């Protein structure tokens, strides 16, 4: 199975999983740790955030790659904003400083 761009979940902007639906594989946590053992901070933020998380960021990357520009802009992960909204939906406040 191989997927380039397919459907995305609506609760979290992330690709689906499985062969029935057009879903890619799941970059596991130990895989993130193995990347951390190496460098690849750029690679990590492209795979985790750009290639997986932000629809705005991933569309920008798609447009840049189909334009001949190996430039990346990570931005912020949308799922992290989802967790912020969850833990903010309780009596616990959380904010990002300057």
Partner 1 sequence: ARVTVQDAVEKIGNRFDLVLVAARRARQMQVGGKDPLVPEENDKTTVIALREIEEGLINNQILDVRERQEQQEQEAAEL
Partner 2 sequence: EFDAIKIALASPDMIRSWSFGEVKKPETINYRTFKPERDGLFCARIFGPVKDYECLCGKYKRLKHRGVICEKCGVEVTQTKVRRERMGHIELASPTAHIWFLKSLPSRIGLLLDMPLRDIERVLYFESYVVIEGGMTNLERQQILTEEQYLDALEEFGDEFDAKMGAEAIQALLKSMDLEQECEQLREELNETNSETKRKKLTKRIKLLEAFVQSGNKPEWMILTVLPVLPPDLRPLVPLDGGRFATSDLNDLYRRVINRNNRLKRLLDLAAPDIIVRNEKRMLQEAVDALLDNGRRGRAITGSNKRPLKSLADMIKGKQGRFRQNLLGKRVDYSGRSVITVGPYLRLHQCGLPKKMALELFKPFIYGKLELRGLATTIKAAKKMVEREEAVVWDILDEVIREHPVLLNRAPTLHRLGIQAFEPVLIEGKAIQLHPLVCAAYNADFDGDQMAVHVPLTLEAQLEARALMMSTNNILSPANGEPIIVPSQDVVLGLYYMTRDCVNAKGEGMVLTGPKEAERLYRSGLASLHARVKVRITEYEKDANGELVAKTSLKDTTVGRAILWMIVPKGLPYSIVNQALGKKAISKMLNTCYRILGLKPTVIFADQIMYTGFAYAARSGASVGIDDMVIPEKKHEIISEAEAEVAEIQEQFQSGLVTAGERYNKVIDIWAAANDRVSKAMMDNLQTETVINRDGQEEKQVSFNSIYMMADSGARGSAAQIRQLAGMRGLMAKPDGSIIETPITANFREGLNVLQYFISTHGARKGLADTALKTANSGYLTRRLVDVAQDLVVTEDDCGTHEGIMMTPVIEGGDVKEPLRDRVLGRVTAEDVLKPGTADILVPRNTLLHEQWCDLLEENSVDAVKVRSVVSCDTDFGVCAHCYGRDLARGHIINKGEAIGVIAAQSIGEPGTQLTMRTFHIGGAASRAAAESSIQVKNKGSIKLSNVKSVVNSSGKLVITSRNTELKLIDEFGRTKESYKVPYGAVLAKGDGEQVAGGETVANWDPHTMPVITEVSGFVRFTDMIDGQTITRQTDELTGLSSLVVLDSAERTAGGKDLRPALKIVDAQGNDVLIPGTDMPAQYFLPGKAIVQLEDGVQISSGDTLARIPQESGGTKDITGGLPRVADLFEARRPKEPAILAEISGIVSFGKETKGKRRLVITPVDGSDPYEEMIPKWRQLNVFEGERVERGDVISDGPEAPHDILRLRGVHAVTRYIVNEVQDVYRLQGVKINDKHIEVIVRQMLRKATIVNAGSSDFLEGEQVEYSRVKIANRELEANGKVGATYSRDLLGITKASLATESFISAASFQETTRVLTEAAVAGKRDELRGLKENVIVGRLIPAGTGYAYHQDRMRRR
Partner RNA sequence: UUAAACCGGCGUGUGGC
Q: What are residue 15's phi and psi, to 5 degrees?
A: -65, 155
Q: Which two structure tokens, joined as six digits, stand for 6?
A: 């397919």
Binding positions for partner 2, 3-42, rule CB under 8 A: 3-6, 10-12, 14-17, 23-42
Is there binding between residue 60 and partner 2 (CB under 8 A)?
no
Chain CA centroid to CA 77, Å? 6
Q: Supply 41's token pair.
A: 């901070």
One of 16, 35, 44, 48 touching RNA (CB under 7 A): 16
Max distance between CA atoms of the chain, in angstroms, equals: 48
Residues near DNA (CB under 7 A): 1, 17-20, 23, 25-26, 28-30
Residues near partner 1 (CB under 8 A): 39, 42, 68-71
């Amino acid at each position: 199975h191989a997927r380039s761009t397919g459907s995305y979940s609506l609760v979290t902007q992330q690709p689906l999983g499985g062969k029935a639906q057009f879903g890619g594989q799941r970059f596991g946590e130990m895989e993130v740790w193995a990347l951390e053992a190496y460098g690849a901070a750029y690679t990590l933020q492209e795979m985790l955030t750009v290639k997986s998380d932000d629809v705005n960021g991933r569309t920008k990357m798609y447009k840049n790659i189909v334009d001949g520009n190996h430039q990346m802009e990570p931005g912020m992960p949308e799922s992290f904003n989802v967790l912020l909204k969850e833990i903010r939906s309780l009596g616990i406040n959380i904010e990002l400083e300057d």
